[PDB]
Write an enzyme that holds these catalytic residues in place. Sequence first.
Site, mmCIF file in Angstrom:
data_model
loop_
_atom_site.group_PDB
_atom_site.id
_atom_site.type_symbol
_atom_site.label_atom_id
_atom_site.label_comp_id
_atom_site.label_asym_id
_atom_site.label_seq_id
_atom_site.Cartn_x
_atom_site.Cartn_y
_atom_site.Cartn_z
ATOM 1 N N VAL A 29 36.302 25.093 64.626
ATOM 2 C CA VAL A 29 35.177 25.920 65.132
ATOM 3 C C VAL A 29 33.962 25.021 65.321
ATOM 4 O O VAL A 29 33.659 24.234 64.435
ATOM 5 C CB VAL A 29 34.867 27.081 64.169
ATOM 6 C CG1 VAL A 29 33.717 27.932 64.668
ATOM 7 C CG2 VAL A 29 36.093 27.941 63.924
ATOM 8 N N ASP A 141 43.646 14.684 76.835
ATOM 9 C CA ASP A 141 43.292 16.135 76.920
ATOM 10 C C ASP A 141 42.056 16.312 77.813
ATOM 11 O O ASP A 141 41.174 17.139 77.463
ATOM 12 C CB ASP A 141 43.126 16.686 75.500
ATOM 13 C CG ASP A 141 43.183 18.191 75.378
ATOM 14 O OD1 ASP A 141 43.721 18.861 76.306
ATOM 15 O OD2 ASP A 141 42.706 18.681 74.348
#
Length: 292
Positions: A29, A141
Amino acid sequence: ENLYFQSMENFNNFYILTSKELGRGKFAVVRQCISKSTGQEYAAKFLKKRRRGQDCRAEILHEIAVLELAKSCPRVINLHEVYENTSEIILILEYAAGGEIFSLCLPELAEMVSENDVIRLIKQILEGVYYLHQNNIVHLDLKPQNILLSSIYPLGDIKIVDFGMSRKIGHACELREIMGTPEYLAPEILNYDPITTATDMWNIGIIAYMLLTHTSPFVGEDNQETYLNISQVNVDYSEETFSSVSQLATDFIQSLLVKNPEKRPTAEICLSHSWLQQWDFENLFHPEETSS
Ligand SMILES: O=C(O)CSc1ncnc2cc(-c3cc4ccccc4s3)sc12
């Protein structure tokens, strides 16, 4: 387990979290924080040390090692501090106040982004990826959600984030690798071929395509169709999709979106592409024919 990084008590003494939640994945998070002492904003990324029943502190240490190497590069998000508690390692990152470049790829914002803007953002991304590849780091990524901006009004500078999947050249395409967002996976990943710097260059092709067309080059109705689009390199270069896209940008994209990774140009060769050669009109040009 003993804790390595600065205590949670120090985190809470030095920083306050704000009500702005920046990002949330399954095992991470990101929340905005503020230094209590300076009032400077940061991004705090909370990484769970235990994931999918696996102890991940070694992998998080490798990710911090990669950020630490790239901290001379202003195209890569800077690491400020690290904290640790029972379950989390917390990265205090540079805050990229503009958020994701993905926002610029939605039809809504199309009219607010010029060709000049897209040329500068792709050049800055190439500068970052060049720096990583010279240090034998493949990001693996580089989706548009993993390239941020220092501001949107006005348009600021790029910050590459999330080194969670990054490796060295020639590492195995393992189960982690083949679990990106399907539409962003290079053909060599679908074929479990070995990791190449060329995989990042494929993704820079996708980013240019999305900034310029405001559409996804590869996504289909389902994953099966996405995987067929990628493996066949089935890309829409139609007159309708490309009516307001220059030939030079088309050439740039077409040189990167090729099935054979060995035929893709390097980051260094991309930085010399004619598309990216532009004179700042406010500078005084010195031609070949001198006054003497
Ligand atoms: O995922 C990671 O590895 C790091 S993510 C991150 N890192 C550093 N600075 C920012 C700013 C964000 C923003 C996200 C967002 C969303 C809406 C409005 C403004 C913003 S600014 S995410 C982030």
